């Protein structure tokens, strides 16, 4: 199921889950590299997003334009981008990192396969070979959860007008 | 094997849909599909259109053909065919999957009550 990708296996009371109840993997097997790459990159950003909304509430960056109150998660976007602003500082940074991914897998991402997907090569904590399998599932399980978490955060916080960690 | 079921163009009917048809259709009917059976239309067209035959159709003829073939969703899957082949086996074996009438309908209780009595031809047993 989905090549040798680690989304299933070590996945709860059952050893393997293999949740693909639309067949987006069997129907499009050439994109399992793309799907993993997207699934992982979604998880990492969502995890930074959720851990994002909380930390500005305590510390603020020394940019001295972000050093202002009332910049909650419903107005920080439309406020910083100016007539340019901090949001472009972040976007340029994300361009620098994303350009690195292009070099490793070629321009058309031809080198992207079902084993190198979502593997930028930053190996500091992991050890051994089975832990990498265990950590890869621990990555996704956290990542998939935060993707739904920040989804609930953004919708509930702006609908019910919470804008803070309880988001209720 | 059967002549018209080989090398049939995907445009006439897809591979998975054709396999689903062949599974749903009883085996004895493959050689000569009856009539008004999707396999009958598949035979009546695959013997006209194919690699060694007419490779093109008018747009309206192809449109009508695409509305005579199954749309891959109106065919029973393997588990449904198993459901039928086993439900009929239960019913003919004298056992009834127990059901209880409800609000204009019945709930299946998931029990096999042996239906025919000791005298199988007796109506009150």
């Amino acid at each position: 199921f989905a090549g040798g990708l680690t989304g299933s296996d070590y996945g709860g009371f059952g050893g393997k889950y293999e949740w693909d109840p639309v067949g987006f993997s069997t129907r499009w097997p050439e994109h399992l590299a793309w799907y993993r790459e997207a699934e992982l990159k979604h998880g990492r950003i969502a995890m930074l997003a959720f851990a994002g909304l909380l930390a500005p509430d305590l510390f603020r960056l020394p940019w001295a334009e972000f050093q202002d109150s009332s910049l909650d998660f419903a107005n920080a976007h439309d406020k910083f981008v100016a007539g340019f602003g901090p949001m472009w500082w972040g976007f340029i940074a994300c361009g620098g990192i994303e350009y690195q991914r292009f070099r490793k897998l070629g321009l058309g991402m031809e080198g992207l396969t079902l084993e190198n997907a979502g593997n930028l090569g930053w190996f500091d904590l992991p050890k051994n070979s089975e832990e990498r399998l265990f950590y890869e599932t621990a990555e996704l399980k956290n990542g998939r959860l935060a993707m739904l978490a920040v989804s609930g955060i953004f919708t509930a916080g702006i609908f019910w007008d919470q804008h803070h960690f309880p988001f209720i | 094997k059967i002549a018209y079921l080989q090398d049939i163009p995907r445009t006439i009917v897809e591979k998975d849909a054709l396999e689903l048809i062949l599974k749903n259709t009883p085996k004895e009917q493959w050689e000569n599909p009856p009539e008004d059976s999707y396999l009958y239309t598949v035979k009546a067209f695959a013997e006209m259109y194919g690699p060694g035959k007419a490779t093109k159709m008018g747009w309206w003829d192809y449109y009508r053909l695409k509305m005579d073939m199954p749309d891959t969703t109106r065919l029973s899957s393997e588990r449904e065919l198993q459901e039928i082949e086993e439900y009929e086996k239960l019913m003919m074996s004298g056992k009834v999957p127990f059901a209880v009438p409800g609000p204009s309908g019945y709930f299946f209780t998931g029990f096999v009550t042996q239906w025919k009595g000791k005298e199988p031809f007796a109506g009150d047993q």
Partner: protein
């Protein structure tokens, strides 16, 4: 009659006959269905400007034959009789002349 020039061919020569037409329409496959209302369904082999009329084929003779059916005859006569009674009632109401 209506297909005087169609290069109509049988299923057995679906991919064998290629001579198109007096027009450039490719040959048409004739399928002999058993339905009496559609005895023969013609299938095309490619794009074609074939003249297929959607109008029915009626004639004066059998339309008159249908109007000569006892229902139509005895409905026209009774309709005219009822209409004549209604017109007489409109023109000579309350039978004052009696």
């Amino acid at each position: 009659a209506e297909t005087e020039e169609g290069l109509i061919i049988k299923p057995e020569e679906a991919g064998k006959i290629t001579s198109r037409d007096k027009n450039n329409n490719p040959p048409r496959i004739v399928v002999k269905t058993n339905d009496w209302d559609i005895p023969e369904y013609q299938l095309s082999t490619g794009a074609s400007n074939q003249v297929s009329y959607i109008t029915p084929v009626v004639e004066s003779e059998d339309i008159k034959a249908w109007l000569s059916l006892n229902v139509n005859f005895f409905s026209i006569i009774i309709l005219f009789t009822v209409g004549g009674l209604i017109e007489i009632q409109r023109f000579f109401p309350d039978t004052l002349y009696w």
